């Protein structure tokens, strides 16, 4: 048959790669980890090393404390019975203060006080994690595109749990820490606001979410179609166009009449995915604050 | 016109049907046998969408809607006005999409490249056929397929979801969503990594794939690599659409209750997990 | 109404973004030419972008794009038709001439380098400490063309050192000289390596490398363009699918 470049035929292994140095403080890099033959069928086989800075450790600390605050309260709801805590894992829920507390931090622990505690731990896990993806790229001399894109996901997460609840007046507006309960929250939200399908930002957000799947499907398959020409060495094809990059452009030009470059496909890529949570955050932010019924709203306007 | 490097690639050959009888371009576009076929299908289907639009009265493109025949019409044909036009449009649309895939096959063959792109497109086509052919035929009526309107197809989603309660509890819907999110996540990261290497801090030299690995090894302790990221992206995108078509090929065929009722398996399993004290017992 | 303001503003924002993105993707290939090489009249509604420069590592120069576009190689094609839009037929052997799906691009005649200034790709015998770590070791296996004859034997693997992955097979020919076969164009089997793209007789015409321990970017484009091009040009000599399935039990 014909090799499709989905799975590696032959794995090769050399002395362990400690990585590029640049201005990374190597005092903070772990040693190389093991190799995984399973992982090397699809991607790289080598694990590690990892960098553990102050920011990374602070992030993993608060990330654990957030996780452990739901974990303590889930054990609690399960009547401290192990067999019960396993069967109802997906139905447990750590829930925000009741609507009458407004934005007060006076909630009793068992009535949304523990929710405010878990949130503070997640607020600090995420924001210190964001700082780590700026610093890791800075230490290497790279651009900050990753940290700027991670800002788009942080925007929607900050709107759901922080920005909208304050503008509305209560912490009850926020999302519960529960596996099934946060799906239930998502459903009630659409109902209460007059069919989120009529929020034109929810419409844009879906278009971009479909489009990201569309776009990565085209681009991943395009690059795989031309891996026979070194096509996945995209950095060197940016600096010195190969026949890989030329056949890729021309597949798309002959198909849909326009086409990209080996560098600007990645600009389409970043913006496709980042507009998902940018539009989405705007849509959610206008709900209950500026618009109460999206369906009724859209009949008036346009 | 041509890109400055295009001419050396515009040679004869690669067709599947018709020799060189259609082996030519129109501007940037390649035609081939299936450019003709695609044109035939889409133009026919568009003509019929217009015909169905004048039977309805309006020319506003947000109001035009071609509905499937009613449920009582089972799996047979219906008159043009009462569902029949939908049925021919579905055939043309299917003919356009399939021909579009095969035209890409011709283009691949001329350019000497893998067939990954049309193959990935077939996953989108098969998802579409799940909603208008495989699921309706399995349910006994074309009337279970979605209508062709910009807002009515949305109301189909809402009506169909709320028929089985909260669709979120559909476990295959859960998986499909996880793939759509992880695809968007991975797409953002992959564009950002390449751009951050190609465009370092002002005044510095272009980075290398070695820096890209180091960045991700530093940040999370693993880097999938430049080839693995493109494989992952395709698999994530195709897995999302696969578990999408699956979540409906079972919805109203292998299962017809509220979808929340599926998760009471482990709870109320024949091992009688009495285990009181919690909400589930 | 503020929501109207917001959605209205986002659509003005989106139009500008698509403008920026499309002009960004015009740094290669543009401005459009006619089928003879001269500038084309209608260039589209998008202007070229303001230039940008890459500083390449290891003092290899800069690159400013968009810049003037010249193929910088022989193109052994010929215009078939009078009006624009028809194929350009090969004037000779397109496999040897490197046109159509055998095409290559006049890239720099130096090797790609890792982050340390070393050759990115080397044979395993000259890459310190590299070995096969999973899968069928293809070294020693006979190498079979799509006409189902044996064309040579694997004598080494060429490895991407920083990325730890196989990129070429080194195949010794009957004359005792070797060639490189793209890893993505070969199937590695229990008792052979099968190459669908090439009949056994076109192996000798694979373009050769000038140094037996490095491969330059230009050499890579020549080797890979050729192998890929056998798909279209070697079809006369490609046995059928059942013919290959039967070849197993021979
Ligand atoms: C409310 C929503 C708030 C949302 C909160 C957070 C938003 C996060 C945005 C996500 C950005 C991800 C994309 C990153 C990117 O491409 O930038 C690379 C770049 C990284 O560069 P580098 O690492 O230093 O590399 C150096 C290179 O040499 C040189 O770098 P380079 O070449 O690699 O990058 C250059 C890049 C620079 O990137 C940016 O400019 C990013 C800008 C982010 C803006 C966020 C959107 C705001 C939403 C407004 C919508 C209104 C609705 C209300 O160029 C662009 O992307 C240009 C922007 C496109 C211009 C389009 C103009 C539209 C106007 C239309 C008018 C005409 C229409 C007529 C009809 O990042 C930035 O520019 C940072 C932007 C930070 C924005 C934070 C937002 C604050 C909150
Ligand atoms: C996929 C799962 C569901 C579904 C659920 C939703 C939901 C929920 C929403 C949409 C929305 C949209 N859907 Mg729908 N939709 C389905 C089936 C389809 C099919 C199809 C033939 O199968 C098509 C073509 C569309 C098309 C569209 C667009 C009108 C819109 C933006 C999507 C987007 O950018 O996607 C990614 C594709 C691209 C980025 C490429 C560009 C494609 C363009 C935009 C298609 C235009 C279609 C045109 C108006 C109608 C056919 C035109 C012919 C020429 C006659 N839907 C099925 C039933 N769809 C969103 C919206 O805003 O609706 C009003 C929205 O909120
Ligand atoms: C009945 C339910 C309603 C509905 C109600 C809602 C509501 C409510 C919301 C959405 C949202 C979304 N909906 Mg809707 N929606 C419905 C119907 C649909 C349909 C469909 C076919 O029917 C589709 C495809 C969509 C599509 C979408 C997406 C475009 C969008 C979410 C983007 C995203 O990736 O978020 C996922 C990404 C994030 C949440 C960002 C995460 C960032 C943080 C920082 C991550 C932290 C990780 C943490 C530390 C954990 C660490 C773990 C360890 C490291 C392992 N909707 C119907 C009408 N939908 C959202 C939106 O934007 O609306 C405008 C939203 O709030
Ligand atoms: C109230 C509604 C219910 C609900 C009920 C449903 C229903 C009902 C459906 C889904 C389906 C989906 N839902 Mg749900 N769902 C809800 C809430 C959500 C939320 C959320 C955050 O709340 C999310 C993220 C999702 C996510 C999703 C996806 C898994 C899936 C949609 C994509 C898909 O399959 O595309 C597949 C892609 C396609 C069908 C595209 C095909 C494109 C074709 C091949 C080509 C078109 C070409 C075009 C005509 C060209 C135009 C011209 C050119 C532009 C020039 N749902 C709520 C609770 N969900 C759908 C599904 O699984 O469908 C299979 C579905 O039908
Ligand atoms: C642009 C939109 C998309 C996006 C973007 C995005 N997200 C990002 C980035 C970007 C560009 C990053 O830079 C950043 C990152 O570093 O990615 C690798 C991140 C990331 N996005 C993530 C998640 C995420 N993104 C999401 C969505 C999206 N992200 C969008 C689709 C979602 C959802 C809901 O769809 C999630 C859940 C993280 C993986 C990461 C941010 C990590 C972070 O802030 O972490 C702090 C928390 C901790 C350090 C630790 C907490 C503790 C654990 C929960 C413990 C439990 C473990 C358990 C006990 C072990 C079980 C083991 C088994 C093997 C048994
Ligand atoms: C499998 C994963 C993802 C995927 C893959 C994918 N799609 C692809 C490709 C790939 C790899 C292509 O190569 C192909 C392409 O060439 O893209 C530029 C394509 C493509 N994906 C498209 C759309 C699309 N893909 C989508 C999704 C995705 N595509 C998946 C998430 C979606 C949605 C809703 O999620 C849409 C809208 C097109 C942009 C393009 C194919 C163009 C094509 O087939 O053209 C021929 C047909 C016509 C020009 C018109 C026919 C018109 C009909 C006869 C009348 C209209 C009928 C229709 C039923 C009406 C619907 C009304 C709506 C309101 C519902
Ligand atoms: C690394 O490489 C890569 C490139 O290159 C270097 C690329 O370019 C691309 C391509 C990617 C882009 C250009 C990014 C932007 C693309 C998207 C956002 C994806 C969605 C695209 C669209 C919305 C456009 C869809 C347009 C279509 C379907 C064309 C419309 C069709 C016509 C008007 C005519 C069609 C022709 C026919 C019917 C037959 C020919 C004509 C006759 C008359 C016969 C990728 C993926 C890539 O990975
Ligand atoms: C054996 O078990 C042990 C004890 C070891 C465990 O630890 C087990 C642990 C578990 C079972 C944990 C289970 C956890 C979950 C199921 C969590 C699932 C989480 C979700 C579904 C997340 C929902 C989305 C959350 C969002 C959108 C949050 C946004 C919040 C922002 C942080 C808001 C900003 C900050 C605020 C409001 C804090 C304000 C307070 C200040 C002091 C500033
Ligand atoms: C995305 C998956 C993340 C997996 C994290 C892998 C981190 C491995 C760290 C290697 C540690 C090696 N050593 C010798 C220090 O133990
Ligand atoms: C998404 C990561 C998945 C990694 C797991 C890979 C699965 C193993 C597939 C083995 C293929 C080996 N073989 C024989 C085809 O070469
Ligand atoms: C907005 C999403 C749907 C857009 C429809 C397709 C856009 C046209 C792009 C094809 C360009 C062909 N052209 C004119 C460059 O030759
Ligand atoms: C950066 C990529 C840009 C692609 C543009 C996609 C636009 C989708 C338009 C869908 C229309 C949605 N809406 C609001 C009319 O309901
Ligand atoms: C919804 C995404 C929109 C895709 C269309 C973007 C631009 C298409 C037109 C490109 C012009 C081609 N041209 C003339 C420069 O060669
Ligand atoms: Fe890429």
Author numbering:
A (entry chain M): 1 to 302
B (entry chain L): 1 to 281
C (entry chain H): 11 to 260
Give the authors' words.
The photosynthetic reaction center (RC) of the purple bacterium Cereibacter sphaeroides (recently renamed from Rhodobacter sphaeroides) is a photosensitive membrane pigment-protein complex that serves as a convenient and informative test model for studying the mechanisms of electron transfer, photosynthesis, and pigment-protein interactions. The RC from С. sphaeroides consists of three protein subunits and ten cofactors arranged in two membrane-spanning branches, A and B. The RC contains two bacteriochlorophylls (BChl), PA and PB, combined into a special pair P, two monomeric BChls, BA and BB, two bacteriopheophytins (BPhe), HA and HB, two quinones, a non-heme Fe atom, and a spheroidene molecule. Of the three protein subunits of C. sphaeroides RC, M and L, are pseudosymmetric with respect to each other and have 5 transmembrane α-helices, whereas subunit H has only one transmembrane α-helix, which is mostly located outside the membrane on the cytoplasmic side. Here we present an approach for stabilization of the photosynthetic reaction center of Cereibacter sphaeroides, which is the formation of disulfide bonds between its α-helices.
At the same time, no alternative conformations for these cysteine residues were visible either. To provide additional confirmation of the formation of these disulfide bonds, SDS-PAGE was used. However, it was observed that the mutations between the L and M subunits (G(М19)С+T(L214)C and V(M84)C+G(L278)C) significantly contributed to the stabilization of the RC. After 60 min of incubation, more than 50% of the native complexes remained in the sample in the case of G(М19)С+T(L214)C and more than 40% in the case of V(M84)C+G(L278)C, which was significantly more compared to about 20% of the undenatured wild-type RCs under the same conditions.
